[PDB]
Design a protein around this ligand. Structure first.
Ligand SMILES: NC[C@@H]1O[C@H](O[C@H]2[C@@H](O)[C@H](O[C@@H]3[C@@H](O)[C@H](N)C[C@H](N)[C@H]3O[C@H]3O[C@H](CO)[C@@H](O)[C@H](O)[C@H]3N)O[C@@H]2CO)[C@H](N)[C@@H](O)[C@@H]1O
Ligand SMILES: [K+]
Ligand SMILES: [K+]
Ligand SMILES: [K+]
Ligand SMILES: [K+]
Ligand SMILES: [K+]
Ligand SMILES: [K+]
Ligand SMILES: [K+]
Ligand SMILES: [K+]
Ligand SMILES: [K+]
Ligand SMILES: [K+]
Ligand SMILES: [K+]
Ligand SMILES: [K+]
Ligand SMILES: [K+]
Ligand SMILES: [K+]
Ligand SMILES: [K+]
Ligand SMILES: [K+]
Ligand SMILES: [K+]
Ligand SMILES: [K+]
Ligand SMILES: [K+]
Ligand SMILES: [K+]
Ligand SMILES: [K+]
Ligand SMILES: [K+]
Ligand SMILES: [K+]
Ligand SMILES: [Mg+2]
Ligand SMILES: [Mg+2]
Ligand SMILES: [Mg+2]
Ligand SMILES: [Mg+2]
Ligand SMILES: [Mg+2]
Ligand SMILES: [Mg+2]
Ligand SMILES: [Mg+2]
Ligand SMILES: [Mg+2]
Ligand SMILES: [Mg+2]
Ligand SMILES: [Mg+2]
Ligand SMILES: [Mg+2]
Ligand SMILES: [Mg+2]
Ligand SMILES: [Mg+2]
Ligand SMILES: [Mg+2]
Ligand SMILES: [Mg+2]
Ligand SMILES: [Mg+2]
Ligand SMILES: [Mg+2]
Ligand SMILES: [Mg+2]
Ligand SMILES: [Mg+2]
Ligand SMILES: [Mg+2]
Ligand SMILES: [Mg+2]
Ligand SMILES: [Mg+2]
Ligand SMILES: [Mg+2]
Ligand SMILES: [Mg+2]
Ligand SMILES: [Mg+2]
Ligand SMILES: [Mg+2]
Ligand SMILES: [Mg+2]
Ligand SMILES: [Mg+2]
Ligand SMILES: [Mg+2]
Ligand SMILES: [Mg+2]
Ligand SMILES: [Mg+2]
Ligand SMILES: [Mg+2]
Ligand SMILES: [Mg+2]
Ligand SMILES: [Mg+2]
Ligand SMILES: [Mg+2]
Ligand SMILES: [Mg+2]
Ligand SMILES: [Mg+2]
Ligand SMILES: [Mg+2]
Ligand SMILES: [Mg+2]
Ligand SMILES: [Mg+2]
Ligand SMILES: [Mg+2]
Ligand SMILES: [Mg+2]
Ligand SMILES: [Mg+2]
Ligand SMILES: [Mg+2]
Ligand SMILES: [Mg+2]
Ligand SMILES: [Mg+2]
Ligand SMILES: [Mg+2]
Ligand SMILES: [Mg+2]
Ligand SMILES: [Mg+2]
Ligand SMILES: [Mg+2]
Ligand SMILES: [Mg+2]
Ligand SMILES: [Mg+2]
Ligand SMILES: [Mg+2]
Ligand SMILES: [Mg+2]
Ligand SMILES: [Mg+2]
Ligand SMILES: [Mg+2]
Ligand SMILES: [Mg+2]
Ligand SMILES: [Mg+2]
Ligand SMILES: [Mg+2]
Ligand SMILES: [Mg+2]
Ligand SMILES: [Mg+2]
Ligand SMILES: [Mg+2]
Ligand SMILES: [Mg+2]
Ligand SMILES: [Mg+2]
Ligand SMILES: [Mg+2]
Ligand SMILES: [Mg+2]
Ligand SMILES: [Mg+2]
Ligand SMILES: [Mg+2]
Ligand SMILES: [Mg+2]
Ligand SMILES: [Mg+2]
Ligand SMILES: [Mg+2]
Ligand SMILES: [Mg+2]
Ligand SMILES: [Mg+2]
Ligand SMILES: [Mg+2]
Ligand SMILES: [Mg+2]
Ligand SMILES: [Mg+2]
Ligand SMILES: [Mg+2]
Ligand SMILES: [Mg+2]
Ligand SMILES: [Mg+2]
Ligand SMILES: [Mg+2]
Ligand SMILES: [Mg+2]
Ligand SMILES: [Mg+2]
Ligand SMILES: [Mg+2]
Ligand SMILES: [Mg+2]
Ligand SMILES: [Mg+2]
Ligand SMILES: [Mg+2]
Ligand SMILES: [Mg+2]
Ligand SMILES: [Mg+2]
Ligand SMILES: [Mg+2]
Ligand SMILES: [Mg+2]
Ligand SMILES: [Mg+2]
Ligand SMILES: [Mg+2]
Ligand SMILES: [Mg+2]
Ligand SMILES: [Mg+2]
Ligand SMILES: [Mg+2]
Ligand SMILES: [Mg+2]
Ligand SMILES: [Mg+2]
Ligand SMILES: [Mg+2]
Ligand SMILES: [Mg+2]
Ligand SMILES: [Mg+2]
Ligand SMILES: [Mg+2]
Ligand SMILES: [Mg+2]
Ligand SMILES: [Mg+2]
Ligand SMILES: [Mg+2]
Ligand SMILES: [Mg+2]
Ligand SMILES: [Mg+2]
Ligand SMILES: [Mg+2]
Ligand SMILES: [Mg+2]
Ligand SMILES: [Mg+2]
Ligand SMILES: [Mg+2]
Ligand SMILES: [Mg+2]
Ligand SMILES: [Mg+2]
Ligand SMILES: [Mg+2]
Ligand SMILES: [Mg+2]
Ligand SMILES: [Mg+2]
Ligand SMILES: [Mg+2]
Ligand SMILES: [Mg+2]
Ligand SMILES: [Mg+2]
Ligand SMILES: [Mg+2]
Ligand SMILES: [Mg+2]
Ligand SMILES: [Mg+2]
Ligand SMILES: [Mg+2]
Ligand SMILES: [Mg+2]
Ligand SMILES: [Mg+2]
Ligand SMILES: [Mg+2]
Lengths: 138, 124
RNA sequence: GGCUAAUCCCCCAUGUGGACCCGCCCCUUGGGGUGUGUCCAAAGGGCUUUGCCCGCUUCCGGAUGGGCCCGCGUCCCAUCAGCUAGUUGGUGGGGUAAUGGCCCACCAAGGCGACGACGGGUAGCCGGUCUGAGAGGAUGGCCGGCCACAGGGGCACUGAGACACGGGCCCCACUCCUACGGGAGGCAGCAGUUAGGAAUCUUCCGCAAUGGGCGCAAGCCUGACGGAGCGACGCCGCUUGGAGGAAGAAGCCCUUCGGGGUGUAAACUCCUGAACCCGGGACGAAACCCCCGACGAGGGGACUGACGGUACCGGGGUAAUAGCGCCGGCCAACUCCGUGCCAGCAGCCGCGGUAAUACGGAGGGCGCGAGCGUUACCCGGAUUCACUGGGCGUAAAGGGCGUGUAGGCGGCCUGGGGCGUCCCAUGUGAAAGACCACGGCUCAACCGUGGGGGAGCGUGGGAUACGCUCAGGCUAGACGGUGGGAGAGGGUGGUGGAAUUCCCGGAGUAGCGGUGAAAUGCGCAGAUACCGGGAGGAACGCCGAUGGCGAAGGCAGCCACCUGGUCCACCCGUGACGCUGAGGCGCGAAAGCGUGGGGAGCAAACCGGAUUAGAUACCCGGGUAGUCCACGCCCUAAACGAUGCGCGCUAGGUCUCUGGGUCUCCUGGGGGCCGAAGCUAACGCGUUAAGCGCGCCGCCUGGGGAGUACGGCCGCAAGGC
RNA sequence: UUCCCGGGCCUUGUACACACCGCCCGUCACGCCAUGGGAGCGGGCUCUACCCGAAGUCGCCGGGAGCCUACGGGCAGGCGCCGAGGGUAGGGCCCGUGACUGGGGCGAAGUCGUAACAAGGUAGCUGUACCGGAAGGUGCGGCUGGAUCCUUUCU
RNA sequence: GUUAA
RNA sequence: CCCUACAAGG
């Protein structure tokens, strides 16, 4: 049994992108799907989709990467350079709207789960609400 | 350590020990000379370093250095201690202030005079 | 003992009203109303004297001040773990303005504690202050708020208010006065003395201003306060001069003796004028009071300045204090002489041993300047207790292993609630300070006015993604079923062969043994070597592996019984039943301890032989404990992978043990090696992670002192934690 | 070409690096300093039991014992509970001293050997146990953090 | 035997 | 002061 299904997903993604996999599967859950929605919308991933692995519900996350590169080590730059869990079981992180961080001067994002739904730090600031600071990406 | 452990035990603010028990953490302390000895430095060095055993008003009896070339201290010279050890004399952690009490200021001193307690000589 | 006044005390009356008992109503803890009964008021004085002023009585309300209560927050030690009899609650009283074990009678047996009670140590707490990018750390002097105390301890009286710093009573210590019976006293008010200390001021002026007490007022009191004095203690403003001036006096320092430096610095010329000296001379002060008016509004009038003949103005007017630290690196600034591991320097690194940029002096230089250094202390740098923001294979650090208690943490779907969380509004957030703006002292320091702040907590309303809780569902985690498997896993009993030792018999004879070489030793009481028999103890050769099993310690001949773990298959049942785990409990190599037994071989100690300069050793000959068994202790370790447990994720190749399958090979569990990505100070690690992540536990925080001392707990002890 | 002396190349261990004529351990001697245990000896705190108990509030009495009285009652006075403090006995705790006594830190060039680092010359380390001027030696078990295929200390 | 280069 | 700046020796 996982202790942080969210952290699990951020890692499955982190580990996969690191070996340039085309896609990667993660145990399904609405909340998790909602986070995926934003990653897609934000262009961190090509997108995702429900799928059934051996009868159980998963979520194929289609990863993105830059172009092949020059010199030695032609591996492409990452779209998702950094994906880190903030709030965690036994150290949940909550923020009021005036406390929502600005990831890399805007170049990156923050994902909070508010009572108005899961939102990017901008979406949250816009709707004027705070919530649980789930993670950060860039 | 986990956050839970931090909640359970927290961190420990560690305090520092004084390098100078001149009690009241007074900047100086008065005392009387019990013994006026001479001492040999450690390893790298060699010389007859001048030290004094002082019985403090703080109830302590510590050895203090007698800086400078001069020096007129005897077994009853009343003097003021200040703290400042001597890298060469293990155990010597204080300096006797020259120019105060029975401690004469170094005579003929013409440079760092304010240390060594030496008044300004007339120039002409 | 006697006399006497009042705004002193008392009785009677009046009763607006109020208090109390009982009833009813409203309201909801003792709030408000109402009815009967009862109980309760008072002080006079002044005059500009037929009417005003000061004041008195009762009641309701306001205002200010305060008491008590509750939530939350508030240092270190667990080497303080159990604390409690007014203790916890009850009923009825006492007490108070008032609730309450606040106090008492009686009844009950409770209350508190690892979310740290109890005990010990330290300490007045805030607004703030200092530091810091922040988070935070440190702090609580001055000023403002609250508390507490008034030589130490207890106590009440008076009063609206005190259990009262300059009131009272008692005890104690101390001082002083005593005709010795007995008395007086309390600067932690201002100033001053003395003691202690490194260290902290005038026995000042004034009540003019602000503020306070009493008075109708005049006014009286006010060491509160407003000022002056002393101390570079701090901060800010100012001076010791400005311009000219030589290819450059002298002196002094270097030198290659040519010259270079101090340096336009001085001298000297001119200019301005800190000090000082005259003359003027404040603001802070207009009220109270008085007259008009109406003792109101409004309008007039008079008195009053400690600071101080000070500030500030105007006139005149002298060129007129500079010191201290430092100069090897860090760190800005170099030469000569003296000295010779001396004398001495030193924040850390270090410097001095006869050419020292480091000592001491000098010349020169750097820094800051009425200061400059030193010592002490706080924050910083120190992400060096790491929340922001660290770690544990070899650097300090994984607990010797397990079981599992509290606790922390928790898979997928739906619904309720709305505790956490988020949002709006609103109350609170004193002043000062901090920040910004503007303004007042010529500036500044200092000061004034204005602006802007927020966290936190209260209240009302709202949201429901996540965490929580309740309710229902699920099957991917977990557990179970059925069928199979491999294993030195554990416990008990039995049993087999090899070898050593010993005893017995045979045979046989001169040595054997041991070493580098020897000797001790053993042998003619016949040893060694050889054959046969017997007894006993201990350990299991080959198989055997780089192998297997176990949580670790650890486990190996063979057989039986009893018993733990684990792996695979089939997807059969349960339906989140999970992970971790402080403390507890159990296990725990060897050595060691107790009681009893055993004792072949080995062997601490020890007895000897050698070796050696010695030889309390290494080599050789003996040999006790012990090594073995039962039972009970001990609880350690290089108890090691020097790597806590679980889970998910991230190339492969190769060897191997064990299982399943359509059996080149595929799939699962385990054991190794090399390697993708990645990690690492490196070495290395690398699907058996030291990679990427989540959860929980343990632990580290420079070396020595020291795993010591003390305390506790444990053990028979050794000793362990 | 085994050995002695000097040397070249590869490799390995190392705690050496003015580099084996290196490094380095413990006892002991001399000097300075902090400190543990400690009979006895004094100072203080604290808890328990019993006893004595000022002031004062409160409660009872207040009587043909006192004062006032409008006879209701008041005052004085007496007694009691509580009670600051004190006494005796006992128990714990802390501080000073302390004969004698244990070890420790530190101080260029004193003494004895040579334990460790290279296979350090008997691989080392280790828990325990006994033993010895000292470092150590030996037993049993463990680990690798062990080199490789006569005898001899120092600097 | 100590301390240096 | 002889050794090398010393310790120790003469
Ligand atoms: N401070 C050292 C501690 O005590 C012991 O060491 C001490 C003694 O063993 C040692 O003594 C040495 C001696 O071993 C060596 N063979 C000769 C030397 N002269 C002595 O030296 C000692 O004494 C002289 C005066 O005589 C002092 O000048 C010197 O500083 C001092 N260390 O000196 C130490 C005294 O400071 C431990 N072995 C050591 O591990 C521990 O840390
Ligand atoms: K009535
Ligand atoms: K009132
Ligand atoms: K109140
Ligand atoms: K009661
Ligand atoms: K504080
Ligand atoms: K504070
Ligand atoms: K008027
Ligand atoms: K003038
Ligand atoms: K001049
Ligand atoms: K010379
Ligand atoms: K110099
Ligand atoms: K510091
Ligand atoms: K350990
Ligand atoms: K243990
Ligand atoms: K809901
Ligand atoms: K089985
Ligand atoms: K013989
Ligand atoms: K094996
Ligand atoms: K025995
Ligand atoms: K590397
Ligand atoms: K102990
Ligand atoms: K005991
Ligand atoms: K040969
Ligand atoms: Mg993550
Ligand atoms: Mg990331
Ligand atoms: Mg912290
Ligand atoms: Mg030296
Ligand atoms: Mg110092
Ligand atoms: Mg009379
Ligand atoms: Mg009368
Ligand atoms: Mg009256
Ligand atoms: Mg009435
Ligand atoms: Mg009426
Ligand atoms: Mg009511
Ligand atoms: Mg009523
Ligand atoms: Mg009525
Ligand atoms: Mg009446
Ligand atoms: Mg009551
Ligand atoms: Mg009452
Ligand atoms: Mg009580
Ligand atoms: Mg306490
Ligand atoms: Mg105090
Ligand atoms: Mg910081
Ligand atoms: Mg104050
Ligand atoms: Mg008091
Ligand atoms: Mg006093
Ligand atoms: Mg008193
Ligand atoms: Mg008192
Ligand atoms: Mg009083
Ligand atoms: Mg007084
Ligand atoms: Mg004095
Ligand atoms: Mg003053
Ligand atoms: Mg006044
Ligand atoms: Mg006044
Ligand atoms: Mg007076
Ligand atoms: Mg004043
Ligand atoms: Mg001063
Ligand atoms: Mg000039
Ligand atoms: Mg004048
Ligand atoms: Mg005026
Ligand atoms: Mg005026
Ligand atoms: Mg007046
Ligand atoms: Mg009139
Ligand atoms: Mg007027
Ligand atoms: Mg002139
Ligand atoms: Mg420089
Ligand atoms: Mg000299
Ligand atoms: Mg100097
Ligand atoms: Mg210097
Ligand atoms: Mg100044
Ligand atoms: Mg810090
Ligand atoms: Mg530190
Ligand atoms: Mg951290
Ligand atoms: Mg670290
Ligand atoms: Mg080590
Ligand atoms: Mg280590
Ligand atoms: Mg372990
Ligand atoms: Mg549990
Ligand atoms: Mg959940
Ligand atoms: Mg839960
Ligand atoms: Mg809520
Ligand atoms: Mg505010
Ligand atoms: Mg607010
Ligand atoms: Mg304010
Ligand atoms: Mg201005
Ligand atoms: Mg303001
Ligand atoms: Mg609210
Ligand atoms: Mg719910
Ligand atoms: Mg459910
Ligand atoms: Mg089912
Ligand atoms: Mg089965
Ligand atoms: Mg077995
Ligand atoms: Mg025979
Ligand atoms: Mg025969
Ligand atoms: Mg013989
Ligand atoms: Mg014969
Ligand atoms: Mg035989
Ligand atoms: Mg036998
Ligand atoms: Mg196994
Ligand atoms: Mg083992
Ligand atoms: Mg099924
Ligand atoms: Mg467990
Ligand atoms: Mg054991
Ligand atoms: Mg044993
Ligand atoms: Mg035994
Ligand atoms: Mg026995
Ligand atoms: Mg033997
Ligand atoms: Mg011999
Ligand atoms: Mg032997
Ligand atoms: Mg091992
Ligand atoms: Mg653990
Ligand atoms: Mg493999
Ligand atoms: Mg495998
Ligand atoms: Mg395999
Ligand atoms: Mg790589
Ligand atoms: Mg590898
Ligand atoms: Mg893992
Ligand atoms: Mg690692
Ligand atoms: Mg530890
Ligand atoms: Mg230690
Ligand atoms: Mg020990
Ligand atoms: Mg031990
Ligand atoms: Mg050779
Ligand atoms: Mg060659
Ligand atoms: Mg070699
Ligand atoms: Mg090397
Ligand atoms: Mg060397
Ligand atoms: Mg009594
Ligand atoms: Mg009484
Ligand atoms: Mg009475
Ligand atoms: Mg008493
Ligand atoms: Mg003692
Ligand atoms: Mg002894
Ligand atoms: Mg010395
Ligand atoms: Mg050895
Ligand atoms: Mg050796
Ligand atoms: Mg050797
Ligand atoms: Mg040997
Ligand atoms: Mg050896
Ligand atoms: Mg041993
Ligand atoms: Mg022996
Ligand atoms: Mg061994
Ligand atoms: Mg080794
Ligand atoms: Mg020898
Ligand atoms: Mg020697
Ligand atoms: Mg040698
Ligand atoms: Mg020697
Ligand atoms: Mg030297």
């Amino acid at each position: 049994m996982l202790t942080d299904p969210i952290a699990d997903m951020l890692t499955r993604i982190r580990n996969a992108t690191r070996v340039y996999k085309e896609s990667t599967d993660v145990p399904a859950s609405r909340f998790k799907e909602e986070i995926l929605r934003i990653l897609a919308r934000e262009g961190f991933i090509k997108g995702y989709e429900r799928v059934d692995v051996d009868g159980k519900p998963y979520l194929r996350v289609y990863l993105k990467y830059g172009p092949r590169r020059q010199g030695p080590d032609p591996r492409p730059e990452q779209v998702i350079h950094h994906i880190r869990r903030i709030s965690k079981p036994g150290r949940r992180v909550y923020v009021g709207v005036k406390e929502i961080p600005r990831v890399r001067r805007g170049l990156g994002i923050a994902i909070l789960s508010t009572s108005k739904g899961v939102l990017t730090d901008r979406e949250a600031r816009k709707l004027g609400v705070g919530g649980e600071l789930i993670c950060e990406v860039w | 350590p986990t956050i839970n452990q931090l909640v359970r035990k927290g961190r420990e603010k560690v305090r520092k020990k004084s390098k100078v028990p001149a009690l009241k953490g007074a900047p100086f302390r008065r005392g009387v000379c019990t013994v006026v000895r001479t001492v040999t430095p450690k390893k790298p060095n060699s010389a007859l370093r001048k030290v004094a055993k002082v019985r403090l008003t703080s109830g302590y009896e510590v050895t203090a250095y007698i800086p400078g070339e001069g020096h007129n201290l005897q077994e009853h010279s009343v003097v003021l201690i200040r703290g400042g050890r001597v890298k060469d004399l293990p155990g010597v952690r204080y300096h006797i202030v020259r120019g105060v009490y029975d401690a004469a200021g170094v005579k003929d001193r013409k440079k760092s005079r304010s240390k060594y307690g030496t008044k300004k000589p007339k120039e002409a």
